[PDB]
Amino acid sequence: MGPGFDFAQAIMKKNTVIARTEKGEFTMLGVYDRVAVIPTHASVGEIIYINDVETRVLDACALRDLTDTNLEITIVKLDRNQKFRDIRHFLPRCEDDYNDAVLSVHTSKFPNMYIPVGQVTNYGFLNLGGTPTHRILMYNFPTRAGQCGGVVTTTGKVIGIHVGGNGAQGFAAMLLHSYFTD
Ligand SMILES: O=C(O)c1ccnn1C1CCOCC1
Numbered sequence: 001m002g003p004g005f006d007f008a009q010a011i012m013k014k015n016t017v018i019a020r021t022e023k024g025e026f027t028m029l030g031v032y033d034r035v036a037v038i039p040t041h042a043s044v045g046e047i048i049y050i051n052d053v054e055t056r057v058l059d060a061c062a063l064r065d066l067t068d069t070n071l072e073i074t075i076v077k078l079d080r081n082q083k084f085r086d087i088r089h090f091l092p093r094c095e096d097d098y099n100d101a102v103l104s105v106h107t108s109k110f111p112n113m114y115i116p117v118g119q120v121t122n123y124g125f126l127n128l129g130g131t132p133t134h135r136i137l138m139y140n141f142p143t144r145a146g147q148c149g150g151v152v153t154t155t156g157k158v159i160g161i162h163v164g165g166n167g168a169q170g171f172a173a174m175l176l177h178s179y180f181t182d
Pocket of ligand 1: 006007010011155156157
C-alpha cells in the first residue's frame with residue numbers, strides 16, 4: 001500500500017517457501033544458494049516439506065550466541081534443485097532498533113499476509129516459552145499462532161524472523177549478515 005510494503009512484497013515473491021515439519025507449517029526465508037532460515041522451535045529433521053515437496057536437509061544448525069544462549073534461528077541447507085536470489089546485502093551488520101517495519105507471512109492458513117507493526121525495539125533478553133533467548137526484536141502488535149517464520153523488513157533491510165508473542169507484543173529473532181558468511 002506504500003514503500004515498506006513494496007520491499008516486503010519483493011522479498012515474499014522471490015525469497016520465501018512454505019516449510020512443513022512435524023511441528024507445523026512455517027514461512028521460511030531463503031537467503032542465498034540453497035540456504036534458508038526457520039525458527040528453531042520448528043524442530044527441523046533429516047527431511048522437510050518445501051511447497052509440499054519432500055526435501056532432504058543437507059545441514060541444519062540451531063544458532064546460539066558465544067554465551068551459549070539460544071538465538072531461536074536455525075539455518076537449513078536444502079537439497080533443492082534451484083537457488084534463492086542472494087539477499088545477504090539486505091541484512092543488517094549490527095544489533096539495532098528500527099522504525100516502520102512490516103511483518104509478512106505466507107502459509108496455507110495465512111496467504112499473502114502483510115502487517116505494519118510500527119517501531120521495532122532492540123529488546124535483547126526474552127524468556128521465550130521457558131527458553132532464555134538473546135537478540136530479540138519487539139513490536140507492539142498482537143501477533144498469533146501461524147505467524148512464526150514471518151519476515152520482518154524495513155525499506156531496504158531484512159531484519160528478523162517472527163518467533164513468538166505474549167498476546168499484546170510480538171517478538172522476532174535478529175538476522176545478522178555475519179550468520180551467512182561462507
Ligand atoms: O528486491 C529489491 O531489490 C527491492 C524492491 C524494493 N526495493 N528493493 C531494494 C532496492 C535497493 O535498495 C534496497 C531495496
